[PDB]
Amino acid sequence: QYEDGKQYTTLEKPVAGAPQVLEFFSFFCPHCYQFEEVLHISDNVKKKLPEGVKMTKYHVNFMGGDLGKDLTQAWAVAMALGVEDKVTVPLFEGVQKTQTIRSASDIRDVFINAGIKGEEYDAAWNSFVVKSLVAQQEKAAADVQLRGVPAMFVNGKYQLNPQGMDTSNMDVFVQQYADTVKYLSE
Amino acid sequence: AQYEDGKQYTTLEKPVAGAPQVLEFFSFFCPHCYQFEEVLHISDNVKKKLPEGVKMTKYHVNFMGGDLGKDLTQAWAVAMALGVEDKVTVPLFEGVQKTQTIRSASDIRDVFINAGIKGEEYDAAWNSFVVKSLVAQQEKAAADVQLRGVPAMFVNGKYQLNPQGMDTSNMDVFVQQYADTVKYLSEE
């Protein structure tokens, strides 16, 4: 039942040295909100990964304009500080549900309210590590010729195809997705 | 208030004949639809400012959540057919997005049962021609306005509400401005 073209597709131009499991998203994308807040795709993929396999998640900025750019930089900060689990929900809800996030300042507020120190955030924001992480996210998207989100890539070789999975039951969907990633990783 | 085309609303280049007077589209999956309904009470506040001779219509969309989204559109058709929208709207939004207890069509069914719609009555409605027609009606309406996202509201098949062109700093003010805009476009 695991067929190229069905649950996944193969990249014409594989990416050397890519992260083992690579997810792209945007805080502006309603489909990404579905993936993260309702389906919890990342969490369920993680649960089924072999112990020696790490998940990487990058923000994309082809949607949202200048604030999209700021959100990619904020995600770098989140990665540099290791606070992804503290800010994902409030950033998603702030952009898409309440629509309270409209500037870089609004983004900063979310980090503070999440328990991340104010001097910590500003040092991170302006750091070379974050500059590097922004470029890293941009390089990865370009390397896989990314044209849409959400997206997930395994070993720089395979792209997940949620269109080929069953969507009548959200639990069934999530587990078919998680199992595909595991099959491609193994 | 001063009402400007391009500000509080936009004018369809391709108007629709025979469209509901005030037509709202939503998805039970959409967080901003959740915000509109469960938090801001946009529909209720719009209704308050309309003469009661101006009917409000609300349709579900299926372009969100795959086959489950289609099932929710069919369930909304059951709600409309049986006149129980005001009983099922809150538990459906809560079930899909908050408690995450709605994962399939059987969970939707249980919400209707708990709202007072017997299982056999729900199933009858689910499989009825009236409900099949209502599904097709919801789909057709979305296609007739080239709909790509939600929440959205259309007036007289001629205008689309433009919340982005309204004052969004104060939510009480936003709701009044939104509802007043619908009134102005309808009082035509």
Place this chain on the structure above:
Amino acid sequence: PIPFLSQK
């Protein structure tokens, strides 16, 4: 509103 699908 913004379209649901996120391309380009």
